[PDB]
Amino acid sequence: TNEIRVAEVADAGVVAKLLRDFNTEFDTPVPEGLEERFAQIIAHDDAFVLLAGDIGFAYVTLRPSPYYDGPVAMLDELYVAPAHRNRGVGTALLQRVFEEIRKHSAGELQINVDEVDTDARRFYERHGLTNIEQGSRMLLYIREL
Amino acid sequence: EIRVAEVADAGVVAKLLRDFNTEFDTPVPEGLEERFAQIIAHDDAFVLLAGDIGFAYVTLRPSPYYDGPVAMLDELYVAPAHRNRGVGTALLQRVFEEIRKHSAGELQINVDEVDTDARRFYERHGLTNIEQGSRMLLYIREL
Ligand SMILES: CC(=O)SCCNC(=O)CCNC(=O)[C@H](O)C(C)(C)COP(=O)(O)OP(=O)(O)OC[C@H]1O[C@@H](n2cnc3c(N)ncnc32)[C@H](O)[C@@H]1OP(=O)(O)O
Ligand SMILES: CC(=O)SCCNC(=O)CCNC(=O)[C@H](O)C(C)(C)COP(=O)(O)OP(=O)(O)OC[C@H]1O[C@@H](n2cnc3c(N)ncnc32)[C@H](O)[C@@H]1OP(=O)(O)O
């Protein structure tokens, strides 16, 4: 019931619902049109969504880098519904992210995370991700436009 | 001034990225010029050049939050002898102008915490490390 699969265009509605649940949990805003945009992204772009049943997802983008022949991957969104956490779903999603980007010969996986999100940080650290390069923490700066 | 690099400019861009990595003692892969020539040719990334002394490398990728892309300033560098004279400011100003032509919904930049001079530069030009009272971190795994 919760095996990991690659989302198809017709799955955009389920992905959108999970993203809304994610934003609702963290009291962050949602634009209209998530479903339509996910449908276009899944069909046409260098990006994919993995679904665990209807209870978790991972949204990955692939973009060019001069450092590698393959892309740099970014896990833009990762979410497991609260009642299904601490059961290995997130581990299985992340393992499948690494499996799928390996098919594309991706040179790196990147993930941005809030410092306050200590559970997610411990999860990523325990599954082979680091905040350190050249002996320094790495920070994300943004400007919304 | 600042110009959008062409495939013919791949040698210059590669040289600057090499110089950047040499300055900070970080690894340089082979084939940078050839890879930049391929990347410049395609439609989801671009390089801005300040003469032959500075560059910005920007990627564009999809997001479900906007019709336009999320832009990332994956590399920004001005040659040491030309710093502190507004070149970086001009490059970043042109980054915003070019991604606006793509209706990009956000610009993202990852930077090391120890690069305090670069962070002061980004903060002075409208970038923030804070959301919901929390700093934002980058995690990676090299593959
Ligand atoms: C770019 C971004 O999206 S960054 C923000 C990341 N997303 C979020 O924070 C959203 C809210 N959180 C979540 O959705 C989840 O907390 C996630 C996605 C971070 C992790 O998902 P989960 O399904 O909880 O992960 P999983 O169960 O595999 O592992 C969590 C812990 O449970 C442990 N665990 C696994 N199976 C079991 C089990 N049967 N019994 C008890 N503990 C278990 C794991 O070992 C892990 O511990 P660790 O973090 O100390 O290594
Ligand atoms: C995604 C990334 O590339 S993150 C890393 C960014 N790149 C680097 O740090 C490389 C080293 N530095 C540089 O190449 C340049 O100095 C840049 C790109 C940071 C700024 O370019 P400049 O042409 O110096 O910018 P400009 O003259 O418009 O503004 C000056 C500000 O640049 C910053 N700056 C100047 N020298 C340096 C330096 N050696 N290292 C970092 N930041 C610097 C300071 O904040 C300075 O402001 P101050 O007068 O308060 O010190």
CA atoms within 13 A on the CB side of B12: 21
Measured CA distances, A70 to A64, A77, A93, B42 (Å): 7, 21, 21, 14
Beta strands A72-80; A108-114: pairing state: parallel
CB contact under 8 A, B138 and A139: yes
Closest CA to B58 of B135, B116, B5: B5
Residues 45-104, chain B: which have Cβ within 8 Å of A? 45, 57, 59-67, 72, 74, 96, 99-100, 104
In a domain, B46, yes or no: yes
Q: Which residue has the tokens 């090391």?
A: B112
CA–CA separation, B143 and A106 (whole Å) = 7
Q: What is the resolution of this structure in A?
A: 1.4
Kindly identify which residue of chain A lies nearest to residue B47, measuring between CA atoms: A66
Structural domain count of chain A: 1
Q: What angle do CA B88, A68, A104 make, to 5 degrees?
A: 125
Minimum CA distance residue for ligand 1 atom 43 = A86
In a domain, A140, yes or no: no
Q: Which residues contact A19 (CB under 8 A, 6 or more apart)?
A: A30, A34, A38, A57, A59, A77, A79, B64
In a domain, A128, yes or no: no
HEC assignment per residue over chain A? CCCEEECCHHHHHHHHHHHHHHHHHCCCCCCCCHHHHHHHHHHHCCEEEEEECCCEEEEEEEECCCCCCCCEEEEEEEEECHHHCCCCHHHHHHHHHHHHHHHCCCCEEEEEEECCCHHHHHHHHHCCCECEECCEEEEEEEEEC
Structural domain boundaries enclosing A93: 4-113
Ligand 1 centre distance from Cα of residue B6 (Å): 45
Q: Which residue has the tokens 């963290």?
A: A26
Residue A105 sits in a domain of what CATH number? 3.40.630.30
In a domain, B101, yes or no: yes
In a domain, B37, yes or no: yes
In a domain, B138, yes or no: no
**Counting ligands in written order, which one lies closest to the CA of residue A123?**
1
In a domain, A48, yes or no: yes
Instruction: For residue A62, list its beta bridge partners.
Output: A73
Q: Which residue has the tokens 């970038």?
A: B127
In a domain, B122, yes or no: no
CA atoms within 13 A on the CB side of A88: 4
Residue A11, token pair as written in the block: 């799955």
Give the SS3 label for residue B9.
Answer: helix
